[PDB]
Design a protein around this nucleic acid. Sequence first.
DNA 1: CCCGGTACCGGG
DNA 2: CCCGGTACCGGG
Lengths: 67, 68
Amino acid sequence: RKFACVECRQQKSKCDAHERAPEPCTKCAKKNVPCILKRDFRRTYKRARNEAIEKRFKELTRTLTNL
Amino acid sequence: KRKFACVECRQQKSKCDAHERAPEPCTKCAKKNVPCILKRDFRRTYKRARNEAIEKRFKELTRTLTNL
DNA sequence: CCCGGTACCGGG
DNA sequence: CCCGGTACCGGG
Ligand SMILES: [Zn+2]
Ligand SMILES: [Zn+2]
Ligand SMILES: [Zn+2]
Ligand SMILES: [Zn+2]
């Protein structure tokens, strides 16, 4: 059907791009950011990803310091 | 604070207007001539699975008795 | 901004 | 009727 754009999918917000024609969806406009489409796109769980990077980062640093 | 859908509409993943329909059963439930019940804790039920499963446990029993 | 958690579309 | 699968609300 009428899928939601990348940003709106990431922010789990109501997207009206499919109605906004070539003009960026309201949301992406209210943020002055390219309203991109990609039926393939999947949301990124930020919070998690960060906790991971911090952990994987410390773990790395720590391991290196072991010399 | 969101408006939950009635049992039947949840079971059928159909648009439910139970709320904006006051005491009168949700549109969908009325047309099906069935009770429009509301239960927050209600979870749908996968029919096709249940059936396929029920047929196996039965057919397994059929082969055992037949294989004798 | 982010997301847990639903409502519901579209199609078989 | 049934559902796979995705849009979006409601809130911190
Ligand atoms: Zn959008
Ligand atoms: Zn957009
Ligand atoms: Zn209903
Ligand atoms: Zn109903």
